[PDB]
Amino acid sequence: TSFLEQLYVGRFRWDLIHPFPRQDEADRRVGDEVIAQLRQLIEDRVDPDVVDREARLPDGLVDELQKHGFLKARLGAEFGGLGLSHMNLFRLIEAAASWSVPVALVMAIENSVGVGPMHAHLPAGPLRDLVEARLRAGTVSGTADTEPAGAANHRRFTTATPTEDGTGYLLNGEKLHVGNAPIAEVLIVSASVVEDGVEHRRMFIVDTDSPGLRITARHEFMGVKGFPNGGMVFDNVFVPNERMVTAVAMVIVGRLHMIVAPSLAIARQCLGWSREFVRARSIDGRPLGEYEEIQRRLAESAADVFAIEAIAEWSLLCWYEQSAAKNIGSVLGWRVAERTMSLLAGEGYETASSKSARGAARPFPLERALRDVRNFRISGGIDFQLDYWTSTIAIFTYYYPDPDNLAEIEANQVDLDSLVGSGLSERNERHLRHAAEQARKFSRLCRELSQRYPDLAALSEHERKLILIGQLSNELLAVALVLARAARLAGDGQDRAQALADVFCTGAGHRIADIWHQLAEEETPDYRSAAA
Amino acid sequence: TSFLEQLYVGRFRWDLIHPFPRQDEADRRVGDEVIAQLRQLIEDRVDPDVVDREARLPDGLVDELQKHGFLKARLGAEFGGLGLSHMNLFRLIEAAASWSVPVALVMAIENSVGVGPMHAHLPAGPLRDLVEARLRAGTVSGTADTEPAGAANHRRFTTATPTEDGTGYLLNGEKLHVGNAPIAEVLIVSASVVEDGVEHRRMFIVDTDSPGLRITARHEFMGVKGFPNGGMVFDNVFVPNERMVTAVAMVIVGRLHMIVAPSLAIARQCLGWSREFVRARSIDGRPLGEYEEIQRRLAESAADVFAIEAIAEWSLLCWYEQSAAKNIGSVLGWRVAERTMSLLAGEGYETASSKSARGAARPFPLERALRDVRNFRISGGIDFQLDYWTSTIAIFTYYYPDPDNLAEIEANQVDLDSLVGSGLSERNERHLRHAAEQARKFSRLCRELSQRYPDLAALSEHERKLILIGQLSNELLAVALVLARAARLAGDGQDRAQALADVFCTGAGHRIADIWHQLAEEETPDYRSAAA
Ligand SMILES: Cc1cc2nc3c(=O)[nH]c(=O)nc-3n(C[C@H](O)[C@H](O)[C@H](O)COP(=O)(O)OP(=O)(O)OC[C@H]3O[C@@H](n4cnc5c(N)ncnc54)[C@H](O)[C@@H]3O)c2cc1C
Ligand SMILES: Cc1cc2nc3c(=O)[nH]c(=O)nc-3n(C[C@H](O)[C@H](O)[C@H](O)COP(=O)(O)OP(=O)(O)OC[C@H]3O[C@@H](n4cnc5c(N)ncnc54)[C@H](O)[C@@H]3O)c2cc1C
């Protein structure tokens, strides 16, 4: 069953996550070999600073990645693929992202939500034969969903009308901010088909060379400069019947690769840059690493990385937890980069090329890292919006008919007896007790709100409270997995894991308290008067 | 006396800030005229997007600013200056920053810490005659203090050794990240003179064309692209005796212009961009401005702007409050820009030129605003470092001998009777009661820490606690001034002020609670093990 699903009804399932899993040693060594090959390739052909300054990937890179099976990492030998586990794909994207995020994002889309991953789901027919033929030949793909109207719209205004002769459909509409679009051979397009008065969302496998399809825009953002990203108009684009697809777990697990892997990569580089800077600097004769606040900030960044690692390992060694991984990964990644900017200060704010030009010891592209990491709280959904959707669509669903374990909620039941054998420190066992108590409190809150509003549609109006509840659920999951991983790695002789776990749960402790304080607001201000 | 100084010893001096001052109407109308002239000039000659993309100001701008007295805004008619009040200079920089921050920063340095502002302090002699001659002719200046060693160092390693013939000094050392350096005619340089075994910090008025002075580096950062910023080597630069200066209120009040004015400008543009985006967008048939979370976020940004306005008006209509204005202004400015990025989402992350290229309705340079605003938590000191220095150098100084008002601290004395006549709402009067109680609690905390460590040097080791205390003092000042300004503007018929005040104090309420929770930490984790 599901740890986070149980957490929503106030159960702290230590037994589901302890002992914390670890990657198979043979599988990890297969990862090590493929990662070494990619690093050789991109370090030879890609200068990340030049890619950022020119906002362009070097000519020939996508080809060379294709020839070595890096755009078919999860496919079998049949397709000239590397047949990597999810854990090893994630590590491959992480490895790419630590050099150039644009390169990582191209690889992430293709190996996550492209026609390659989709192949296995398609039924036998012409479409499946075409995708296979393209994959053998080597293809680049993208998902074209977002419209100017907004991604958060339940409807898609891009229409698919059947042709008079019934052979295919005419696509009409606009797609915005589409990853890989400018280099894509084929796009997975979302469009509405009207069937006798009722609108229906359908997916279409559309060639980019289709007449009436126009890549009008090439999008450049604050970060990920060089990442192929395009907007397009469909003007009566003819799409044969077979090209119409005829689950969403592929999209959720895809976020681990597209969002969390690059977030971890950046968080790791930032920790590296923090340590190198602290090692080489001093204030008033005393080396910078001796000042308490500097020590705490290195600890907090190190603990954040450990937490991104925990959520990533739990997600890919094995559902709702993988949904929360998007926000936990992206936010922790952004925090580390923000913290690192404060630490490196003036040098941190300075561009890599500027520092390189003046022969600086540390030409670290931290400012690029901070601009890039911001993407991952936007791309794949806005953090507060995902926090809202998580609590209304996945937390109050268990309470609206009524909670099945309602007796447990009124009784304030907390199983402290199942946390007895851990291997955790006396402090990390205290963190574990408190998280289990907070789990039960979380459910009691959810019950009061559900009792307070009979209609969910009415409850769904109170967005701030539901966002905070989304956040609270993520904090407790992060604490739980961090303690589980700590117990495991400490058990296998990594004693630093206890300290890292201790730092993170202490911090989470303050964020949880803050979230409760905001939830406990009795009277709301007239924010509508203020907004005007 | 000083409101913030009294706040440090737990006194809430409502009587010192109520009624809140307002700018003289005649003075403000003089501001309106000068601001209109600057806007005409820069809107004609400066394209802010081009300045950002090329990281260069257009040729001739500094001249045209000089010819119209914008680099001598606070000087008298004698010098061809505009003789503006501090409040009007701040508004002039704000007006410039709302168009192009680089332009604002050049003007801010010259009108704050340049040779122009310094003129009045200099004693009669050749140096004063030279500065006057330069100011009449039109000059550009900068302060060269920061060295590769770090700005936070008490010592400066740049040396000034007297010449054998005793006519002047030889300057040797390196300065980093110097504003206006590449366009400066003269620089105010910090350097150490050794007098019979004891080091001494001295200021030198050095011409940039001095042989042995080399502008080796031209610094480009994440934001403020185009802002002239240079690093230099001094190789036995000869400086005549008269060129050696022979208080720091000029630097503190300068921060209002260099840090807070551009922070307010960005915060205001961001609120404007938020409202325009919300007005034009809808989700599921419902316009975006009808969703609670959207309403709250517009309210929180509007309330933040109001708070930056409050600290700015209190600082320039009239010391320690002006020190805290740096952090309050910069942080609130950064929060608004961060909040705005989440709101505008994909469009928000996209560059102005990208959105312009594809004929977007809103080619808003939000991403540029976010990159620029980050500067103001670094430039003029790192936010957490200023929070540390504020509590060790300006909060515990009143408690180390002992607190003069110790009786008040033990007695938990809170004057609720002086807050009776305000004009505030019943909610904003509650906010006022709570701030006065938090003021007293703040002093009781400070007493316990002072009692706990007999030696300040020992107390100064505990950096996290002292930073949090710095933060707590700033939050209560912000609440106090917001309520004071609200009472005044509501009294003069602006009823929205009550709502804006209410939004801000509610938010501050949560930040204060969070700060206390972190202060109340009983046992600390082993962060030194984690840092490694
Ligand atoms: C680098 C990058 C790459 C991308 N690549 C792709 C891609 O390959 N394919 C693709 O399809 N898309 C892609 N996107 C689009 C991205 O997923 C969207 O930008 C994002 O999911 C939503 O952005 P939007 O501008 O459409 O926001 P909207 O959905 O319009 O939201 C606008 C604002 O309103 C808020 N809001 C929305 N609904 C509510 C509500 N009910 N209550 C309160 N507030 C609400 C949102 O949180 C947001 O702050 C990419 C984006 C980026 C930045
Ligand atoms: C755009 C820009 C313009 C600038 N213009 C000028 C200018 O015109 N003139 C000028 O002189 N300078 C200028 N500066 C320099 C700027 O003021 C400094 O960068 C800043 O004050 C300190 O930066 P630093 O790199 O020297 O940091 P450092 O002082 O080396 O600090 C390094 C880190 O250590 C931390 N730290 C320091 N002391 C302690 C302590 N005791 N305990 C714990 N942690 C500590 C700091 O908070 C920081 O995080 C400019 C900077 C920028 C970004």
Side-chain angles (χ1 to χ4, degrees):
Chain A
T1 182
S2 168
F3 176 89
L4 189 51
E5 192 175 316
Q6 296 287 324
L7 182 55
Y8 294 158
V9 301
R11 286 210 191 104
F12 197 88
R13 289 301 227 92
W14 183 243
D15 60 313
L16 284 175
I17 54 164
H18 181 73
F20 195 78
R22 293 194 70 180
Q23 192 181 10
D24 180 273
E25 290 152 330
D27 189 53
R28 179 169 272 265
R29 283 196 309 273
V30 178
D32 292 340
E33 289 180 359
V34 175
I35 289 166
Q37 289 174 252
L38 183 66
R39 289 215 169 106
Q40 171 257 338
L41 174 52
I42 64 179
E43 286 181 27
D44 177 52
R45 293 173 73 77
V46 181
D47 187 340
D49 179 37
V50 170
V51 168
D52 188 42
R53 294 210 317 263
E54 299 193 358
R56 178 177 288 277
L57 291 171
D59 296 315
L61 176 60
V62 169
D63 303 342
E64 203 63 47
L65 291 173
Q66 187 76 259
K67 284 199 308 174
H68 289 134
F70 289 121
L71 300 191
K72 298 186 287 189
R74 286 213 79 239
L75 300 191
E78 30 164 11
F79 292 118
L82 307 179
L84 299 189
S85 59
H86 273 302
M87 189 67 261
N88 274 335
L89 174 59
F90 176 91
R91 290 172 72 211
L92 195 64
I93 302 306
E94 196 279 338
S98 68
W99 187 248
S100 179
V101 174
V103 179
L105 290 187
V106 174
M107 290 179 60
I109 286 171
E110 201 63 33
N111 292 297
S112 295
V113 302
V115 295
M118 271 193 72
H119 168 270
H121 316 315
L122 290 171
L127 174 56
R128 199 169 181 284
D129 295 347
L130 174 57
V131 167
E132 283 185 26
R134 292 276 173 77
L135 286 167
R136 287 185 211 105
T139 197
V140 179
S141 44
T143 314
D145 185 53
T146 304
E147 302 170 347
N153 281 291
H154 176 261
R155 299 221 293 157
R156 286 298 170 272
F157 302 97
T158 298
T159 62
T161 69
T163 54
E164 178 153 17
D165 69 343
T167 52
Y169 296 83
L170 299 177
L171 282 172
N172 287 294
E174 307 184 74
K175 298 293 177 183
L176 209 66
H177 302 141
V178 179
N180 278 357
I183 58 159
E185 184 180 351
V186 64
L187 283 174
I188 303 150
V189 186
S190 74
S192 294
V193 178
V194 185
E195 294 179 341
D196 279 315
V198 50
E199 210 180 35
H200 285 297
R201 256 58 69 176
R202 297 293 164 184
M203 292 194 292
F204 297 87
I205 310 309
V206 184
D207 292 351
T208 56
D209 76 337
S210 295
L213 209 184
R214 293 187 284 271
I215 46 157
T216 48
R218 48 168 184 179
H219 301 284
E220 183 181 346
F221 311 90
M222 186 167 63
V224 302
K225 296 194 177 302
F227 172 46
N229 193 287
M232 60 208 72
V233 167
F234 299 80
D235 192 354
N236 290 322
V237 174
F238 176 75
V239 170
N241 285 326
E242 51 263 45
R243 293 302 191 87
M244 182 183 70
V245 173
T246 194
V248 311
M250 192 184 65
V251 171
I252 284 166
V253 77
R255 270 166 189 191
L256 268 296
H257 305 306
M258 292 181 291
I259 303 296
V260 180
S263 291
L264 179 52
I266 288 167
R268 275 194 179 147
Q269 289 293 103
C270 284
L271 179 52
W273 296 327
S274 292
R275 291 198 176 126
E276 270 300 306
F277 177 84
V278 163
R279 283 183 185 115
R281 294 287 283 235
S282 61
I283 300 294
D284 301 324
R286 196 180 174 185
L288 188 55
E290 290 188 359
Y291 292 95
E292 172 183 304
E293 183 56 20
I294 302 302
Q295 284 162 9
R296 281 172 176 278
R297 280 179 176 253
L298 288 174
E300 285 162 349
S301 291
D304 279 4
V305 164
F306 190 91
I308 300 166
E309 285 170 358
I311 188 79
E313 284 173 11
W314 175 250
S315 290
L316 298 193
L317 304 178
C318 303
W319 186 289
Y320 291 85
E321 291 98 85
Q322 299 172 322
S323 194
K326 199 287 194 183
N327 273 358
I328 293 159
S330 53
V331 168
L332 286 183
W334 172 80
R335 273 201 200 117
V336 170
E338 253 299 294
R339 191 148 46 214
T340 304
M341 182 58 78
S342 294
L343 199 64
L344 273 71
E347 185 190 294
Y349 191 52
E350 191 175 359
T351 70
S353 55
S354 181
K355 283 183 289 194
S356 173
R358 69 182 180 79
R362 298 172 297 281
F364 297 164
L366 173 58
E367 66 90 23
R368 188 182 67 208
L370 183 55
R371 296 158 37 218
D372 294 354
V373 79
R374 194 61 179 80
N375 183 38
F376 303 119
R377 290 173 52 211
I378 296 171
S379 182
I382 296 291
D383 51 4
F384 76 75
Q385 197 55 26
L386 296 186
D387 281 329
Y388 173 78
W389 281 328
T390 290
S391 51
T392 75
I393 287 163
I395 317 199
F396 291 90
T397 96
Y398 300 100
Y399 293 79
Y400 264 79
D402 258 354
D404 187 292
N405 67 313
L406 179 53
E408 294 186 348
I409 295 160
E410 168 69 313
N412 269 70
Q413 184 153 111
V414 174
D415 185 21
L416 298 178
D417 317 19
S418 63
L419 325 170
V420 171
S422 24
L424 289 171
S425 73
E426 297 175 6
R427 282 181 54 73
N428 287 331
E429 275 187 320
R430 200 177 299 158
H431 284 309
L432 189 56
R433 277 203 312 104
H434 283 209
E437 289 173 310
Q438 284 297 350
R440 188 46 62 200
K441 288 170 198 185
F442 175 95
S443 68
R444 303 181 71 240
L445 159 72
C446 286
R447 177 57 185 182
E448 293 187 352
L449 285 198
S450 61
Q451 281 176 312
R452 188 166 169 70
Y453 305 75
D455 195 6
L456 185 56
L459 187 273
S460 74
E461 301 275 43
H462 293 70
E463 297 194 317
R464 177 51 61 89
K465 255 164 203 150
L466 291 164
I467 291 157
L468 289 179
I469 287 162
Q471 293 191 257
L472 184 48
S473 78
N474 283 359
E475 291 296 340
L476 290 173
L477 176 63
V479 162
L481 296 181
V482 154
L483 289 162
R485 184 171 190 249
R488 179 55 191 270
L489 293 189
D492 304 351
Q494 297 179 21
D495 264 314
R496 255 189 79 213
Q498 295 268 16
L500 289 162
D502 194 5
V503 171
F504 184 84
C505 294
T506 300
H510 295 122
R511 292 197 293 284
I512 289 162
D514 179 36
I515 286 166
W516 280 112
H517 199 62
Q518 293 180 59
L519 283 168
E521 253 208 58
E522 192 173 357
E523 281 185 341
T524 182
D526 180 8
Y527 51 83
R528 275 168 197 156
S529 288
Chain B
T1 182
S2 168
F3 176 89
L4 189 51
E5 192 175 316
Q6 296 287 324
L7 182 55
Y8 294 158
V9 301
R11 286 210 191 104
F12 197 88
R13 289 301 227 92
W14 183 243
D15 60 313
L16 284 175
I17 54 164
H18 181 73
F20 195 78
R22 293 194 70 180
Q23 192 181 10
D24 180 273
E25 290 152 330
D27 189 53
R28 179 169 272 265
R29 283 196 309 273
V30 178
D32 292 340
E33 289 180 359
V34 175
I35 289 166
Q37 289 174 252
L38 183 66
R39 289 215 169 106
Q40 171 257 338
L41 174 52
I42 64 179
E43 286 181 27
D44 177 52
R45 293 173 73 77
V46 181
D47 187 340
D49 179 37
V50 170
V51 168
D52 188 42
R53 294 210 317 263
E54 299 193 358
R56 178 177 288 277
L57 291 171
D59 296 315
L61 176 60
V62 169
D63 303 342
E64 203 63 47
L65 291 173
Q66 187 76 259
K67 284 199 308 174
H68 289 134
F70 289 121
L71 300 191
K72 298 186 287 189
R74 286 213 79 239
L75 300 191
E78 30 164 11
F79 292 118
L82 307 179
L84 299 189
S85 59
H86 273 302
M87 189 67 261
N88 274 335
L89 174 59
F90 176 91
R91 290 172 72 211
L92 195 64
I93 302 306
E94 196 279 338
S98 68
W99 187 248
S100 179
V101 174
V103 179
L105 290 187
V106 174
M107 290 179 60
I109 286 171
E110 201 63 33
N111 292 297
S112 295
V113 302
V115 295
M118 271 193 72
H119 168 270
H121 316 315
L122 290 171
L127 174 56
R128 199 169 181 284
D129 295 347
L130 174 57
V131 167
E132 283 185 26
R134 292 276 173 77
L135 286 167
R136 287 185 211 105
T139 197
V140 179
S141 44
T143 314
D145 185 53
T146 304
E147 302 170 347
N153 281 291
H154 176 261
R155 299 221 293 157
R156 286 298 170 272
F157 302 97
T158 298
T159 62
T161 69
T163 54
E164 178 153 17
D165 69 343
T167 52
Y169 296 83
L170 299 177
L171 282 172
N172 287 294
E174 307 184 74
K175 298 293 177 183
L176 209 66
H177 302 141
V178 179
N180 278 357
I183 58 159
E185 184 180 351
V186 64
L187 283 174
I188 303 150
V189 186
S190 74
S192 294
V193 178
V194 185
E195 294 179 341
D196 279 315
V198 50
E199 210 180 35
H200 285 297
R201 256 58 69 176
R202 297 293 164 184
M203 292 194 292
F204 297 87
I205 310 309
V206 184
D207 292 351
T208 56
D209 76 337
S210 295
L213 209 184
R214 293 187 284 271
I215 46 157
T216 48
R218 48 168 184 179
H219 301 284
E220 183 181 346
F221 311 90
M222 186 167 63
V224 302
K225 296 194 177 302
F227 172 46
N229 193 287
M232 60 208 72
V233 167
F234 299 80
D235 192 354
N236 290 322
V237 174
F238 176 75
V239 170
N241 285 326
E242 51 263 45
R243 293 302 191 87
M244 182 183 70
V245 173
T246 194
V248 311
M250 192 184 65
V251 171
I252 284 166
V253 77
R255 270 166 189 191
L256 268 296
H257 305 306
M258 292 181 291
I259 303 296
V260 180
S263 291
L264 179 52
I266 288 167
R268 275 194 179 147
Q269 289 293 103
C270 284
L271 179 52
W273 296 327
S274 292
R275 291 198 176 126
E276 270 300 306
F277 177 84
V278 163
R279 283 183 185 115
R281 294 287 283 235
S282 61
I283 300 294
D284 301 324
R286 196 180 174 185
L288 188 55
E290 290 188 359
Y291 292 95
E292 172 183 304
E293 183 56 20
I294 302 302
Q295 284 162 9
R296 281 172 176 278
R297 280 179 176 253
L298 288 174
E300 285 162 349
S301 291
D304 279 4
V305 164
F306 190 91
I308 300 166
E309 285 170 358
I311 188 79
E313 284 173 11
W314 175 250
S315 290
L316 298 193
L317 304 178
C318 303
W319 186 289
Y320 291 85
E321 291 98 85
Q322 299 172 322
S323 194
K326 199 287 194 183
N327 273 358
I328 293 159
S330 53
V331 168
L332 286 183
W334 172 80
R335 273 201 200 117
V336 170
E338 253 299 294
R339 191 148 46 214
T340 304
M341 182 58 78
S342 294
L343 199 64
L344 273 71
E347 185 190 294
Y349 191 52
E350 191 175 359
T351 70
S353 55
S354 181
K355 283 183 289 194
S356 173
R358 69 182 180 79
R362 298 172 297 281
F364 297 164
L366 173 58
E367 66 90 23
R368 188 182 67 208
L370 183 55
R371 296 158 37 218
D372 294 354
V373 79
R374 194 61 179 80
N375 183 38
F376 303 119
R377 290 173 52 211
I378 296 171
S379 182
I382 296 291
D383 51 4
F384 76 75
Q385 197 55 26
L386 296 186
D387 281 329
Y388 173 78
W389 281 328
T390 290
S391 51
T392 75
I393 287 163
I395 317 199
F396 291 90
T397 96
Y398 300 100
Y399 293 79
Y400 264 79
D402 258 354
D404 187 292
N405 67 313
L406 179 53
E408 294 186 348
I409 295 160
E410 168 69 313
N412 269 70
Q413 184 153 111
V414 174
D415 185 21
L416 298 178
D417 317 19
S418 63
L419 325 170
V420 171
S422 24
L424 289 171
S425 73
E426 297 175 6
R427 282 181 54 73
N428 287 331
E429 275 187 320
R430 200 177 299 158
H431 284 309
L432 189 56
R433 277 203 312 104
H434 283 209
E437 289 173 310
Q438 284 297 350
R440 188 46 62 200
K441 288 170 198 185
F442 175 95
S443 68
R444 303 181 71 240
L445 159 72
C446 286
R447 177 57 185 182
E448 293 187 352
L449 285 198
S450 61
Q451 281 176 312
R452 188 166 169 70
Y453 305 75
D455 195 6
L456 185 56
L459 187 273
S460 74
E461 301 275 43
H462 293 70
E463 297 194 317
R464 177 51 61 89
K465 255 164 203 150
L466 291 164
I467 291 157
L468 289 179
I469 287 162
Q471 293 191 257
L472 184 48
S473 78
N474 283 359
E475 291 296 340
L476 290 173
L477 176 63
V479 162
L481 296 181
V482 154
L483 289 162
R485 184 171 190 249
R488 179 55 191 270
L489 293 189
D492 304 351
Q494 297 179 21
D495 264 314
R496 255 189 79 213
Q498 295 268 16
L500 289 162
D502 194 5
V503 171
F504 184 84
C505 294
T506 300
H510 295 122
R511 292 197 293 284
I512 289 162
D514 179 36
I515 286 166
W516 280 112
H517 199 62
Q518 293 180 59
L519 283 168
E521 253 208 58
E522 192 173 357
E523 281 185 341
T524 182
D526 180 8
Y527 51 83
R528 275 168 197 156
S529 288

